[PDB]
mmCIF file of all heavy atoms in Angstrom:
data_model
loop_
_atom_site.group_PDB
_atom_site.id
_atom_site.type_symbol
_atom_site.label_atom_id
_atom_site.label_comp_id
_atom_site.label_asym_id
_atom_site.label_seq_id
_atom_site.Cartn_x
_atom_site.Cartn_y
_atom_site.Cartn_z
ATOM 1 N N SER A 1 56.816 133.604 123.795
ATOM 2 C CA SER A 1 57.659 134.323 124.728
ATOM 3 C C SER A 1 57.306 133.788 126.192
ATOM 4 O O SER A 1 58.349 133.392 126.780
ATOM 5 C CB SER A 1 57.249 135.830 124.613
ATOM 6 O OG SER A 1 58.264 136.508 123.932
ATOM 7 N N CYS A 2 56.135 133.860 126.656
ATOM 8 C CA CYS A 2 55.768 133.332 127.964
ATOM 9 C C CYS A 2 55.125 132.035 127.949
ATOM 10 O O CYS A 2 55.072 131.249 128.957
ATOM 11 C CB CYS A 2 54.791 134.374 128.647
ATOM 12 S SG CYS A 2 53.159 134.481 127.935
ATOM 13 N N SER A 3 54.701 131.611 126.775
ATOM 14 C CA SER A 3 53.984 130.312 126.554
ATOM 15 C C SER A 3 52.694 130.211 127.353
ATOM 16 O O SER A 3 52.322 129.190 127.840
ATOM 17 C CB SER A 3 54.979 129.181 127.082
ATOM 18 O OG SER A 3 54.793 128.086 126.301
ATOM 19 N N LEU A 4 51.940 131.284 127.295
ATOM 20 C CA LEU A 4 50.705 131.424 127.961
ATOM 21 C C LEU A 4 49.573 130.896 127.128
ATOM 22 O O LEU A 4 49.472 131.295 125.867
ATOM 23 C CB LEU A 4 50.407 132.751 128.442
ATOM 24 C CG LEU A 4 49.032 133.051 129.137
ATOM 25 C CD1 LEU A 4 49.189 132.732 130.687
ATOM 26 C CD2 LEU A 4 48.591 134.471 128.969
ATOM 27 N N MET A 5 48.708 130.027 127.590
ATOM 28 C CA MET A 5 47.588 129.469 126.815
ATOM 29 C C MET A 5 46.423 130.368 126.720
ATOM 30 O O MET A 5 45.840 130.800 127.721
ATOM 31 C CB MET A 5 47.100 128.120 127.392
ATOM 32 C CG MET A 5 47.943 126.930 126.896
ATOM 33 S SD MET A 5 47.203 125.289 127.438
ATOM 34 C CE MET A 5 48.117 124.229 126.330
ATOM 35 N N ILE A 6 46.063 130.849 125.539
ATOM 36 C CA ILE A 6 44.889 131.753 125.374
ATOM 37 C C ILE A 6 43.904 131.224 124.392
ATOM 38 O O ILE A 6 44.252 130.595 123.417
ATOM 39 C CB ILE A 6 45.342 133.140 124.882
ATOM 40 C CG1 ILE A 6 46.170 133.014 123.670
ATOM 41 C CG2 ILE A 6 46.250 133.795 125.966
ATOM 42 C CD1 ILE A 6 45.368 133.095 122.359
ATOM 43 N N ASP A 7 42.634 131.451 124.604
ATOM 44 C CA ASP A 7 41.613 130.983 123.724
ATOM 45 C C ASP A 7 40.912 132.246 122.955
ATOM 46 O O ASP A 7 40.031 132.814 123.358
ATOM 47 C CB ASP A 7 40.552 130.231 124.463
ATOM 48 C CG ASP A 7 41.089 129.098 125.327
ATOM 49 O OD1 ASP A 7 41.903 129.383 126.196
ATOM 50 O OD2 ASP A 7 40.600 127.961 125.052
ATOM 51 N N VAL A 8 41.449 132.474 121.720
ATOM 52 C CA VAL A 8 41.004 133.557 120.925
ATOM 53 C C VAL A 8 39.845 133.123 120.104
ATOM 54 O O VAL A 8 39.910 132.103 119.407
ATOM 55 C CB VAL A 8 42.111 134.151 120.056
ATOM 56 C CG1 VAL A 8 42.627 133.136 119.012
ATOM 57 C CG2 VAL A 8 41.636 135.392 119.296
ATOM 58 N N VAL A 9 38.736 133.889 120.136
ATOM 59 C CA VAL A 9 37.518 133.595 119.420
ATOM 60 C C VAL A 9 37.554 134.360 118.006
ATOM 61 O O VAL A 9 38.035 135.454 117.910
ATOM 62 C CB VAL A 9 36.263 133.947 120.075
ATOM 63 C CG1 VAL A 9 36.185 135.406 120.345
ATOM 64 C CG2 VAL A 9 35.008 133.454 119.319
ATOM 65 N N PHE A 10 37.049 133.738 116.987
ATOM 66 C CA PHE A 10 36.994 134.268 115.639
ATOM 67 C C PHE A 10 35.570 134.134 114.990
ATOM 68 O O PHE A 10 34.878 133.120 115.215
ATOM 69 C CB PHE A 10 37.998 133.593 114.747
ATOM 70 C CG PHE A 10 37.883 132.097 114.503
ATOM 71 C CD1 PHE A 10 36.863 131.687 113.527
ATOM 72 C CD2 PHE A 10 38.653 131.216 115.105
ATOM 73 C CE1 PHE A 10 36.633 130.259 113.388
ATOM 74 C CE2 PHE A 10 38.470 129.856 115.018
ATOM 75 C CZ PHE A 10 37.435 129.336 114.138
ATOM 76 N N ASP A 11 35.221 135.086 114.200
ATOM 77 C CA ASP A 11 33.937 135.093 113.609
ATOM 78 C C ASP A 11 33.936 134.507 112.124
ATOM 79 O O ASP A 11 32.969 134.032 111.627
ATOM 80 C CB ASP A 11 33.352 136.601 113.366
ATOM 81 C CG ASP A 11 31.858 136.646 113.574
ATOM 82 O OD1 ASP A 11 31.090 136.007 112.815
ATOM 83 O OD2 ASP A 11 31.505 137.408 114.527
ATOM 84 N N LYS A 12 35.196 134.315 111.681
ATOM 85 C CA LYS A 12 35.434 133.706 110.353
ATOM 86 C C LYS A 12 34.815 134.610 109.159
ATOM 87 O O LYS A 12 34.478 134.048 108.165
ATOM 88 C CB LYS A 12 34.752 132.278 110.341
ATOM 89 C CG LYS A 12 35.480 131.337 109.493
ATOM 90 C CD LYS A 12 34.786 129.922 109.364
ATOM 91 C CE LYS A 12 35.388 129.095 108.232
ATOM 92 N NZ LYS A 12 36.291 128.108 108.736
ATOM 93 N N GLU A 13 34.736 135.851 109.472
ATOM 94 C CA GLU A 13 34.222 136.819 108.462
ATOM 95 C C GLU A 13 35.319 137.501 107.714
ATOM 96 O O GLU A 13 35.522 137.342 106.503
ATOM 97 C CB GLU A 13 33.313 137.849 109.219
ATOM 98 C CG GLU A 13 32.387 138.654 108.224
ATOM 99 C CD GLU A 13 31.059 138.895 108.634
ATOM 100 O OE1 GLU A 13 30.867 139.161 109.875
ATOM 101 O OE2 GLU A 13 30.133 138.686 107.839
ATOM 102 N N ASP A 14 36.105 138.220 108.439
ATOM 103 C CA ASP A 14 37.299 139.025 107.952
ATOM 104 C C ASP A 14 38.378 138.043 107.324
ATOM 105 O O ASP A 14 39.020 138.337 106.421
ATOM 106 C CB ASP A 14 38.015 139.850 109.036
ATOM 107 C CG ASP A 14 37.220 141.148 109.208
ATOM 108 O OD1 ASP A 14 35.944 141.072 109.345
ATOM 109 O OD2 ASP A 14 37.935 142.157 109.302
ATOM 110 N N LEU A 15 38.379 136.737 107.812
ATOM 111 C CA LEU A 15 39.217 135.708 107.364
ATOM 112 C C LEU A 15 39.134 135.561 105.741
ATOM 113 O O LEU A 15 40.170 135.414 105.160
ATOM 114 C CB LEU A 15 39.006 134.427 108.052
ATOM 115 C CG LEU A 15 40.197 133.682 108.560
ATOM 116 C CD1 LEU A 15 39.832 132.948 109.823
ATOM 117 C CD2 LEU A 15 40.845 132.769 107.565
ATOM 118 N N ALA A 16 37.887 135.732 105.303
ATOM 119 C CA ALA A 16 37.712 135.511 103.851
ATOM 120 C C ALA A 16 37.712 136.900 103.147
ATOM 121 O O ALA A 16 38.264 137.041 102.039
ATOM 122 C CB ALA A 16 36.294 134.893 103.614
ATOM 123 N N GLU A 17 37.172 137.969 103.791
ATOM 124 C CA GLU A 17 37.147 139.311 103.319
ATOM 125 C C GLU A 17 38.620 139.889 103.188
ATOM 126 O O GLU A 17 38.915 140.496 102.137
ATOM 127 C CB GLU A 17 36.228 140.194 104.167
ATOM 128 C CG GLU A 17 35.786 141.487 103.414
ATOM 129 C CD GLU A 17 34.652 142.113 104.232
ATOM 130 O OE1 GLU A 17 33.656 141.422 104.620
ATOM 131 O OE2 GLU A 17 34.710 143.386 104.321
ATOM 132 N N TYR A 18 39.441 139.664 104.131
ATOM 133 C CA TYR A 18 40.705 140.124 104.150
ATOM 134 C C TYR A 18 41.556 139.522 102.964
ATOM 135 O O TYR A 18 42.527 140.238 102.416
ATOM 136 C CB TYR A 18 41.530 139.711 105.497
ATOM 137 C CG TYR A 18 42.715 140.507 105.716
ATOM 138 C CD1 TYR A 18 42.671 141.670 106.540
ATOM 139 C CD2 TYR A 18 43.934 140.076 105.270
ATOM 140 C CE1 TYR A 18 43.791 142.429 106.789
ATOM 141 C CE2 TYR A 18 45.035 140.861 105.575
ATOM 142 C CZ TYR A 18 45.058 141.998 106.276
ATOM 143 O OH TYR A 18 46.191 142.655 106.603
ATOM 144 N N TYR A 19 41.243 138.449 102.413
ATOM 145 C CA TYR A 19 41.901 137.730 101.294
ATOM 146 C C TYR A 19 41.805 138.748 100.121
ATOM 147 O O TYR A 19 42.678 138.792 99.365
ATOM 148 C CB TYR A 19 41.262 136.395 101.044
ATOM 149 C CG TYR A 19 41.953 135.244 101.735
ATOM 150 C CD1 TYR A 19 42.182 135.275 103.174
ATOM 151 C CD2 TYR A 19 42.449 134.184 101.062
ATOM 152 C CE1 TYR A 19 42.831 134.331 103.845
ATOM 153 C CE2 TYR A 19 43.026 133.138 101.728
ATOM 154 C CZ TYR A 19 43.283 133.182 103.117
ATOM 155 O OH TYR A 19 43.880 132.245 103.766
ATOM 156 N N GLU A 20 40.595 139.429 100.013
ATOM 157 C CA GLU A 20 40.331 140.245 98.862
ATOM 158 C C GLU A 20 41.068 141.599 99.122
ATOM 159 O O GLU A 20 41.447 142.304 98.178
ATOM 160 C CB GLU A 20 38.935 140.419 98.622
ATOM 161 C CG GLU A 20 38.267 139.318 97.801
ATOM 162 C CD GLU A 20 36.762 139.209 98.021
ATOM 163 O OE1 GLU A 20 36.245 139.117 99.076
ATOM 164 O OE2 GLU A 20 36.069 139.366 96.913
ATOM 165 N N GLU A 21 41.081 142.013 100.340
ATOM 166 C CA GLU A 21 41.667 143.320 100.754
ATOM 167 C C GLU A 21 43.186 143.340 100.541
ATOM 168 O O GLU A 21 43.780 144.184 99.969
ATOM 169 C CB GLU A 21 41.325 143.586 102.231
ATOM 170 C CG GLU A 21 39.858 144.125 102.503
ATOM 171 C CD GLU A 21 39.726 144.419 103.892
ATOM 172 O OE1 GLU A 21 39.657 143.490 104.787
ATOM 173 O OE2 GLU A 21 39.448 145.612 104.275
ATOM 174 N N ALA A 22 43.924 142.231 101.094
ATOM 175 C CA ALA A 22 45.328 142.108 101.009
ATOM 176 C C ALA A 22 45.667 141.657 99.565
ATOM 177 O O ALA A 22 44.878 141.119 98.898
ATOM 178 C CB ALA A 22 45.847 141.115 102.020
ATOM 179 N N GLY A 23 46.911 142.065 99.117
ATOM 180 C CA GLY A 23 47.421 141.837 97.885
ATOM 181 C C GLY A 23 48.354 140.631 97.795
ATOM 182 O O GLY A 23 49.412 140.620 97.056
ATOM 183 N N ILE A 24 48.182 139.607 98.724
ATOM 184 C CA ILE A 24 49.029 138.489 98.892
ATOM 185 C C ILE A 24 48.690 137.499 97.800
ATOM 186 O O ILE A 24 47.686 137.352 97.203
ATOM 187 C CB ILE A 24 48.877 137.765 100.202
ATOM 188 C CG1 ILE A 24 49.886 136.673 100.389
ATOM 189 C CG2 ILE A 24 47.471 137.254 100.412
ATOM 190 C CD1 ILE A 24 50.179 136.212 101.806
ATOM 191 N N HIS A 25 49.675 136.665 97.357
ATOM 192 C CA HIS A 25 49.553 135.612 96.367
ATOM 193 C C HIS A 25 49.324 134.187 97.036
ATOM 194 O O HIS A 25 50.217 133.509 97.344
ATOM 195 C CB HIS A 25 50.746 135.576 95.504
ATOM 196 C CG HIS A 25 50.603 134.707 94.189
ATOM 197 N ND1 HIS A 25 50.077 135.330 93.029
ATOM 198 C CD2 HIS A 25 50.875 133.418 93.882
ATOM 199 C CE1 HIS A 25 49.980 134.338 92.184
ATOM 200 N NE2 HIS A 25 50.487 133.246 92.637
ATOM 201 N N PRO A 26 47.959 133.847 97.156
ATOM 202 C CA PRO A 26 47.584 132.549 97.738
ATOM 203 C C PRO A 26 47.959 131.396 96.771
ATOM 204 O O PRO A 26 48.183 131.565 95.679
ATOM 205 C CB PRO A 26 46.106 132.739 97.908
ATOM 206 C CG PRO A 26 45.662 133.734 96.892
ATOM 207 C CD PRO A 26 46.867 134.662 96.818
ATOM 208 N N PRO A 27 48.125 130.165 97.441
ATOM 209 C CA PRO A 27 48.404 128.958 96.705
ATOM 210 C C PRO A 27 47.227 128.513 95.722
ATOM 211 O O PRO A 27 46.100 129.009 95.825
ATOM 212 C CB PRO A 27 48.584 127.874 97.733
ATOM 213 C CG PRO A 27 47.707 128.353 98.875
ATOM 214 C CD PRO A 27 47.829 129.896 98.822
ATOM 215 N N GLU A 28 47.562 127.562 94.820
ATOM 216 C CA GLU A 28 46.611 127.024 93.815
ATOM 217 C C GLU A 28 46.131 128.169 92.803
ATOM 218 O O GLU A 28 46.255 129.329 93.114
ATOM 219 C CB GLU A 28 45.318 126.608 94.559
ATOM 220 C CG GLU A 28 45.251 125.087 95.027
ATOM 221 C CD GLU A 28 43.954 124.456 94.942
ATOM 222 O OE1 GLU A 28 43.203 124.631 95.911
ATOM 223 O OE2 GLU A 28 43.724 123.826 93.935
ATOM 224 N N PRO A 29 45.976 127.669 91.624
ATOM 225 C CA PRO A 29 45.540 128.662 90.508
ATOM 226 C C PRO A 29 44.202 129.282 90.684
ATOM 227 O O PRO A 29 43.351 128.806 91.453
ATOM 228 C CB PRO A 29 45.562 127.703 89.309
ATOM 229 C CG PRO A 29 45.170 126.410 89.766
ATOM 230 C CD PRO A 29 45.867 126.293 91.128
ATOM 231 N N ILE A 30 44.038 130.397 90.074
ATOM 232 C CA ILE A 30 42.753 131.174 90.146
ATOM 233 C C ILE A 30 41.987 131.199 88.856
ATOM 234 O O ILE A 30 42.413 131.855 87.910
ATOM 235 C CB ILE A 30 42.922 132.598 90.658
ATOM 236 C CG1 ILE A 30 43.829 132.635 91.941
ATOM 237 C CG2 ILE A 30 41.603 133.331 90.922
ATOM 238 C CD1 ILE A 30 44.860 133.709 91.842
ATOM 239 N N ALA A 31 40.896 130.480 88.759
ATOM 240 C CA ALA A 31 40.110 130.458 87.590
ATOM 241 C C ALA A 31 38.834 131.299 87.658
ATOM 242 O O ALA A 31 38.148 131.334 88.621
ATOM 243 C CB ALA A 31 39.549 128.983 87.370
ATOM 244 N N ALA A 32 38.795 132.172 86.608
ATOM 245 C CA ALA A 32 37.676 133.158 86.487
ATOM 246 C C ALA A 32 36.625 132.682 85.563
ATOM 247 O O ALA A 32 36.889 132.767 84.290
ATOM 248 C CB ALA A 32 38.199 134.517 86.215
#
């Protein structure tokens, strides 16, 4: 919208946890 440069920091924690919380269908097969 404004094209403003921002530096957002991430812990890289929820990034993996959210994958289990959400019911999205990620790429590649899932082997159990």
Side-chain angles (χ1 to χ4, degrees):
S1 261
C2 70
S3 214
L4 180 85
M5 278 191 163
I6 58 90
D7 307 59
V8 62
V9 63
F10 61 76
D11 217 296
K12 212 185 168 98
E13 193 139 44
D14 280 45
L15 230 148
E17 200 162 315
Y18 199 90
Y19 270 52
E20 279 162 301
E21 286 179 293
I24 186 161
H25 193 87
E28 270 212 278
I30 310 137

